[PDB]
Amino acid sequence: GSELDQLRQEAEQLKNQIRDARKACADATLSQITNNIDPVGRIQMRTRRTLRGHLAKIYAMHWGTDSRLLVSASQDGKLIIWDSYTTNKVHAIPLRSSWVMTCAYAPSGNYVACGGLDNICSIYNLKTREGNVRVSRELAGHTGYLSCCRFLDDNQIVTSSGDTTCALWDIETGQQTTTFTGHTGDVMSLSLAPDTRLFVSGACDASAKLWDVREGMCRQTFTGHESDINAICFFPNGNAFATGSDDATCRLFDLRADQELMTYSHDNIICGITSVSFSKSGRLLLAGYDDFNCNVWDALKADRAGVLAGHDNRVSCLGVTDDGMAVATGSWDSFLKIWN
Amino acid sequence: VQLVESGGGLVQPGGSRKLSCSASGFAFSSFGMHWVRQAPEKGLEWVAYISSGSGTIYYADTVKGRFTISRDDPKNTLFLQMTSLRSEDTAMYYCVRSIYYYGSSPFDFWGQGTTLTVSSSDIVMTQATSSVPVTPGESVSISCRSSKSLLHSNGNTYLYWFLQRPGQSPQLLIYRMSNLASGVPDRFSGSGSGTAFTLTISRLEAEDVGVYYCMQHLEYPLTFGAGTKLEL
Amino acid sequence: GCTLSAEDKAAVERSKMIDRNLREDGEKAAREVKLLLLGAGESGKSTIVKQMKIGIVETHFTFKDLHFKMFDVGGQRSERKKWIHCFEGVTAIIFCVALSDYDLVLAEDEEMNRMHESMKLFDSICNNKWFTDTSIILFLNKKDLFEEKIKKSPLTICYPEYAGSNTYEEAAAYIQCQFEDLNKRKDTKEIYTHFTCATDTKNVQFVFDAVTDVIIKNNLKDCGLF
Amino acid sequence: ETLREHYQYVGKLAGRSTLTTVLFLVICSFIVLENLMVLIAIWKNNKFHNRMYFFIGNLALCDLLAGIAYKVNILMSGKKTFSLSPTVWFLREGSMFVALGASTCSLLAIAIERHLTMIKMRPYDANKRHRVFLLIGMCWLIAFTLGALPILGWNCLHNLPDCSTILPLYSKKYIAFCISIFTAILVTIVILYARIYFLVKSSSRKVANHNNSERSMALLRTVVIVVSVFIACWSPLFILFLIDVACRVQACPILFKAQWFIVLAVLNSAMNPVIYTLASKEMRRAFFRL
Amino acid sequence: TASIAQARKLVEQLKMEANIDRIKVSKAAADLMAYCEAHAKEDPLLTPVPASENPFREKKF
Ligand SMILES: CCCCCCCCCCCCC/C=C\[C@@H](O)[C@@H](N)COP(=O)(O)O
Ligand SMILES: CCCCCCCCCCCCCCCC(=O)O
Ligand SMILES: CCCCCCCCCCCCCCCC(=O)O
Ligand SMILES: CCCCCCCCCCCCCCCC(=O)O
Ligand SMILES: CCCCCCCCCCCCCCCC(=O)O
Numbered sequence A: 001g002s003e004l005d006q007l008r009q010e011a012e013q014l015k016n017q018i019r020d021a022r023k024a025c026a027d028a029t030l031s032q033i034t035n036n037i038d039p040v041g042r043i044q045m046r047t048r049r050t051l052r053g054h055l056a057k058i059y060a061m062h063w064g065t066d067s068r069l070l071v072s073a074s075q076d077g078k079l080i081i082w083d084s085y086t087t088n089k090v091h092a093i094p095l096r097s098s099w100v101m102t103c104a105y106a107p108s109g110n111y112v113a114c115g116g117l118d119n120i121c122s123i124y125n126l127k128t129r130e131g132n133v134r135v136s137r138e139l140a141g142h143t144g145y146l147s148c149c150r151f152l153d154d155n156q157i158v159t160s161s162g163d164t165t166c167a168l169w170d171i172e173t174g175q176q177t178t179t180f181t182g183h184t185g186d187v188m189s190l191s192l193a194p195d196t197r198l199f200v201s202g203a204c205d206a207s208a209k210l211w212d213v214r215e216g217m218c219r220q221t222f223t224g225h226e227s228d229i230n231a232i233c234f235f236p237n238g239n240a241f242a243t244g245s246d247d248a249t250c251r252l253f254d255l256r257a258d259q260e261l262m263t264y265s266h267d268n269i270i271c272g273i274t275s276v277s278f279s280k281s282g283r284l285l286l287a288g289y290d291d292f293n294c295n296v297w298d299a300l301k302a303d304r305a306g307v308l309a310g311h312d313n314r315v316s317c318l319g320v321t322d323d324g325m326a327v328a329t330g331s332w333d334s335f336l337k338i339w340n
Numbered sequence B: 001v002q003l004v005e006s007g008g009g010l011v012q013p014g015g016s017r018k019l020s021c022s023a024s025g026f027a028f029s030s031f032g033m034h035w036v037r038q039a040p041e042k043g044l045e046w047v048a049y050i051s052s053g054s055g056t057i058y059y060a061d062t063v064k065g066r067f068t069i070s071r072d073d074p075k076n077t078l079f080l081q082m083t084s085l086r087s088e089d090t091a092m093y094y095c096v097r098s099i100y101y102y103g104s105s106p107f108d109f110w111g112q113g114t115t116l117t118v119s120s121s122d123i124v125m126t127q128a129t130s131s132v133p134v135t136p137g138e139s140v141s142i143s144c145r146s147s148k149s150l151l152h153s154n155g156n157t158y159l160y161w162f163l164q165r166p167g168q169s170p171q172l173l174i175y176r177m178s179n180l181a182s183g184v185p186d187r188f189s190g191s192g193s194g195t196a197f198t199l200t201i202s203r204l205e206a207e208d209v210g211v212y213y214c215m216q217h218l219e220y221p222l223t224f225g226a227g228t229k230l231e232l
Numbered sequence C: 001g002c003t004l005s006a007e008d009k010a011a012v013e014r015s016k017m018i019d020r021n022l023r024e025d026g027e028k029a030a031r032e033v034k035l036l037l038l039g040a041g042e043s044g045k046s047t048i049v050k051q052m053k054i055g056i057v058e059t060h061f062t063f064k065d066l067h068f069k070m071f072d073v074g075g076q077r078s079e080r081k082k083w084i085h086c087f088e089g090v091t092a093i094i095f096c097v098a099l100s101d102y103d104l105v106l107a108e109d110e111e112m113n114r115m116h117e118s119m120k121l122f123d124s125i126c127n128n129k130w131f132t133d134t135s136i137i138l139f140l141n142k143k144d145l146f147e148e149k150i151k152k153s154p155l156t157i158c159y160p161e162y163a164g165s166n167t168y169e170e171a172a173a174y175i176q177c178q179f180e181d182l183n184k185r186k187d188t189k190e191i192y193t194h195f196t197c198a199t200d201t202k203n204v205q206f207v208f209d210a211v212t213d214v215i216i217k218n219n220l221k222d223c224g225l226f
Numbered sequence D: 001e002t003l004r005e006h007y008q009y010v011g012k013l014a015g016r017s018t019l020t021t022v023l024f025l026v027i028c029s030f031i032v033l034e035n036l037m038v039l040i041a042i043w044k045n046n047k048f049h050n051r052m053y054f055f056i057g058n059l060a061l062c063d064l065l066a067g068i069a070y071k072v073n074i075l076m077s078g079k080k081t082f083s084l085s086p087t088v089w090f091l092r093e094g095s096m097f098v099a100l101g102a103s104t105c106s107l108l109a110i111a112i113e114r115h116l117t118m119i120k121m122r123p124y125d126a127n128k129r130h131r132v133f134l135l136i137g138m139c140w141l142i143a144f145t146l147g148a149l150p151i152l153g154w155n156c157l158h159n160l161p162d163c164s165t166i167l168p169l170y171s172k173k174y175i176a177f178c179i180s181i182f183t184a185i186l187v188t189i190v191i192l193y194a195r196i197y198f199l200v201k202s203s204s205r206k207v208a209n210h211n212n213s214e215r216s217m218a219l220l221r222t223v224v225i226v227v228s229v230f231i232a233c234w235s236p237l238f239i240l241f242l243i244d245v246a247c248r249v250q251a252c253p254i255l256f257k258a259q260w261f262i263v264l265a266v267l268n269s270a271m272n273p274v275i276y277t278l279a280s281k282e283m284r285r286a287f288f289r290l
Numbered sequence E: 001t002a003s004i005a006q007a008r009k010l011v012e013q014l015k016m017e018a019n020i021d022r023i024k025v026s027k028a029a030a031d032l033m034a035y036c037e038a039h040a041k042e043d044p045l046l047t048p049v050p051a052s053e054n055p056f057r058e059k060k061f
Helices: A002-024 C006-026 C047-051 C114-126 C144-152 C168-180 C201-222 D002-010 D019-044 D052-076 D086-119 D130-148 D172-206 D210-246 D253-257 D259-275 D281-289 E003-017 E025-042
Strands: A047-051 A058-063 A069-074 A078-083 A089-094 A102-105 A111-115 A120-125 A134-140 A146-151 A156-161 A165-170 A176-181 A187-192 A198-203 A207-212 A218-223 A229-234 A240-245 A250-254 A262-264 A273-278 A284-289 A294-298 A304-308 A315-320 A327-331 A336-339 B002-006 B017-024 B032-038 B044-050 B057-059 B067-072 B077-082 B091-098 B114-118 B131-133 B140-145 B159-164 B171-175 B188-193 B196-201 B211-216 B228-231 C032-039 C057-063 C066-072 C092-098 C135-141 C191-195
Touching: A002 E003, A058 A102, A058 A315, A058 A327, A069 A102, A078 A111, A089 C006, A102 A146, A111 A146, A120 A156, A156 A187, A165 A187, A198 A229, A207 A229, A218 E003, A229 A273, A240 A273, A273 A315, A284 A315, B002 B091, B017 B091, B017 B114, B032 B067, B044 B067, B044 B077, B057 B067, B159 B188, B171 B188, B196 B211, C032 C201, C047 C135, C047 C201, C066 C201, C092 C114, C092 C201, C114 C135, C114 C168, C135 C168, C135 C201, C144 C168, C168 C191, C191 C201, C201 D086, C201 D172, C201 D210, D002 D086, D019 D052, D019 D259, D052 D086, D052 D130, D052 D259, D086 D130, D086 D172, D086 D259, D172 D210, D210 D253, D210 D259, D253 D259
Parallel strands: A146 A187, A187 A229, B131 B228, C032 C066, C032 C092, C092 C135, C135 C191
Antiparallel strands: A047 A336, A058 A069, A069 A078, A078 A089, A102 A111, A111 A120, A120 A134, A146 A156, A156 A165, A165 A176, A187 A198, A198 A207, A207 A218, A229 A240, A240 A250, A250 A262, A273 A284, A284 A294, A294 A304, A315 A327, A327 A336, B002 B017, B017 B077, B032 B044, B032 B091, B044 B057, B067 B077, B091 B114, B140 B196, B159 B171, B159 B211, B188 B196, B211 B228, C057 C066
16 A cells, blocks of 8 residues: 555665664774784683583573572483582472473572473572472463573563563562563573663574663664574673674674674684673683584684583583683583583 | 470380481471480580481490481481480480581471480580670670681581570571571671680570570581570 | 591582482483474374374373373474474474365465475475484375365376376375475485374374384494494 | 323324414414404594493403414414423413403303393483493403313323323313303304394384385394304314314324314404494494594 | 554654664774773683682692
8 A cells, every 4th residue: 555655665764874874983993993902812721520410412501699509401301500619419400391491590599490492481499498499480471482581680580482572570470561572583592781771682583682671662773693693692891792693603792882893703614603601801702603612702803712622512501600710511412511 | 397206204224215206397308317415404415417318327426336316218207216224314305407518507497305314536615604694785795615626628617506595495596607597687696716706696685595505517426515594 | 538527428428319319310211202293284183192192292101011202392383493403312203194185275375285385394304404314104194085085176286297097096105105205315214104094003003113113223223233 | 291291191292384383473463453453443432322332342352362362372382382381381271261261252242232232122221331341340250260260270180091182281071161161152142143133024024114124134144144254263163172072092183283273263353353343334434434 | 454553663663773872983992992901800711810719620539
């Protein structure tokens, strides 16, 4: 109809105006500014602890708030809490569904969340008078496999599903309070800001969106990738984030300036990225490639400075401690390794 | 959670008796158990300890080779047996639960207690103070002293503070000399280093009257301190 | 134990107990057969479940001292390639196809028919990168109505390059050959074809026979005897 | 002078040509080099997720020890025999006996492991390692005990008639016991290899495809090849031993040519790592890659 | 008849996405540069620390 044609034309001319406005402020590049700093030397890490006991592919992990404990999730149907200092096991949580894709650890250390491919997010209580671990709340309402989940606080949690939607839950009531829509492809990962006010979600449509927790409405949209976006994480400062996609290319974006800053790729790498994480100071970028090893990138010079090759299968989960003392990498060979 | 104990009574010097305790309200299969003996009008001392799964069994040197402790997981019942009871075997017995992992608080629930009467190196814990009159509304300090250093290489300080109210089972207050227990107010606090340790109360009320004991857990056997009493 | 304190030996003992429990529970799930059920829609994949009935749907049953676990993931309604790698260790794949759908037309497109949609979905699943050595079991459902449908309307509509006797036997054989021709390996993957009967004993027996052959082939490869 | 008297009664002293020794040394060097290559190829890969690696490595090590022992025996058995004391000769024979026992028991252990693996219908491995270590320890203990038995008393030093011609100081009872053990092991191995193809064919008959038929034919060919290769080389030595047990003094001249029969077992030890490593896809690919 | 409603929603989103303020890339570039320099002193992964205070160090056993 005539109304359809005129509305489509209006949408197109907004896109041209957005592109023109974005290109107008691209006065300089980050490479020119950081061309004067001295490059960091070769980064060498060794495995200090080896964590064994899993009998299936490891799909997720998350460091504790005290930088001493961590949790791991595998497809065998078990959730194991590890003491990284002495390798000892603290808890072993059976799962109702053997298929799990994500896990999370509460900032207060009292609860652990898990879920994936079952449309339900389960919350487990660690500090129980009876001395065991029991489920406390099951959140349902999604129509697709859950890809990520992060604890906003002791009472609220945000999850992303495969039905191009994101929701914010309330553990006390168990009902959704805010729903985020607008994506075209399945959302694969999310990250929370240090101040827990905003968050970013990457989807399969090669686009990232910035959302507002309090307002519940989208703020900005970032594009530039050519394939599915697998990982995302904020900068320690909180004004930038890095994305890892399946075209063998990592990118760094910004919030105040809606333009691309760096591209991290090599002609010898044709393999996708499964995990992305920064360091304490935001200088080293750890990207978990699915070609049986991990790479270390300098965020300011986009130059490789170290390779972590100690796994015999795909690397799927990667984490960094709060104090930046060590990193933990999990793989499909059911082995966790702490590098320092 | 509760512990019910039975089997006490009056026995002759020549004879044997067994004591039993029934656990409920918690997972008895993953909780270590301890036995505590409290002599009348005197202090209390540790007796025996059994681990989770009957892996390690420890006995006190005083009654080593005479007492037998056994555990029954399916029925949630712990047994203790005494072969030959002497004159100095008359006291009140308590059963204590304890779980050991990173961040756990052992010696949490102390049970109720049972009575038994009979017809007629190691770190020592000392407490110079025996009784001090006090008026509610002012700070109270209790000091305990040891004979060695309880500070381990890992940084832990295995010292426990607990209170015994008149006619009531002891309740844990401070574990590892720094961490507060669960269900107790914030008035109680503990601070110490090396050999000397202190327990401090900010505001005093009518429910704080009792007897204070200091325990060490660096290595077996576990030795308690002299009873310190507070008068209203 | 020389340096560990009294509160650290107990922690080590607890960790050993956890390790023992994990090993005991890990050897019980290594003797269970895992099967993945796929279909193209209204192909009878819900009737085949009731025949051997004791997000994702899990069905567990026993037959001749062997435990089978079948997973239904047809209601996911999401991208297939984002979670298909999870079902990489399955023993075999059960496929349901209705051969009486050669005359019905798809709702989305009038020109497109349901028969070609099943053919293209089978080709994608069979030639996947994660199922290079996974055997496929193919079931031809709703074969009873095919006989009556083949006399009033010839099957030349679906296959315009077919010239047969217009009988049930020749038509069924031609359809089976077309589906079996989609295989591109022919050396590492074997395809088992069966016609579903009214009784349920034959269907379960065929599945039991198929998985037994697959297990022995894996056993021979593992021990290096083949 | 016990060796001089003992050889005289047997007849080896009666009546007591260099290329044969050179050929024996060359073949021994070939065997030891090939077995060392097999062992280092096995050790090259760290993907020790299969139980076959331990058994193949143990067999290679036993064959290496057998080759080294045969080299030492041929070096020290030329013309110095009258100079060695009886204890040193006892050690020389015991080394060969231990080597051959430990190179023969490994095949039986492999057969046990394969039969136990195939007999149980397990879709996935349970990741258990008790059987491998138990079998290796048991076979090593049996070989060591059998080798150390004759030196611990079973001799013919004070009993002139009651010992064999091939070994002038070793009684015939020990040889008969060794023959009985060997024939029991052979029967067990044959039965174990026979009781697998029948089950495989019976299972594959229900679902008839080309792949099933080709797999059954390949399995039958492999089983027949392995059984024939094992039997054909080990038969003549024990046939000669049985003849010696059944022969008399100076009755059998062919009994003096036992070297041409020992070399058959030596060649069997040479050919053992060929079939067991170059008959499967994974083993061949691992060997070729590294 | 719902096509116009979806188009109206899409253009309304584009209204807000094009009305936000922007700054120069160099200013954003400098802020990331300054943050790394100031916090590089307390980064164990960047500057290796002596083994005396390392909590994840491996002893003989
Ligand atoms: C469980 C059954 C395993 C059985 C293993 C039996 C193995 C048999 C091999 C034993 C044969 C070793 C004899 C070796 C060399 C002799 O010919 C020389 N001693 C004689 O040479 P001379 O003194 O004239 O120089
Ligand atoms: C050269 C000697 C080898 C050992 C000979 C005895 C065989 C011992 C191993 C098999 C015994 C039966 C084991 C049945 C249970 C199991 O499969 O673990
Ligand atoms: C001296 C001759 C000894 C023969 C020994 C034959 C041993 C192999 C045949 C019996 C194996 C039995 C294994 C368990 C039963 C089964 O096969 O299910
Ligand atoms: C090696 C010296 C003894 C002679 C041979 C004894 C019999 C063969 C070894 C034990 C076989 C046990 C039965 C077959 C294997 C099994 O099913 O456990
Ligand atoms: C023992 C030395 C000779 C070895 C080769 C002899 C001839 C073999 C003929 C059969 C070939 C078919 C089997 C090939 C091996 C396989 O398929 O694993």
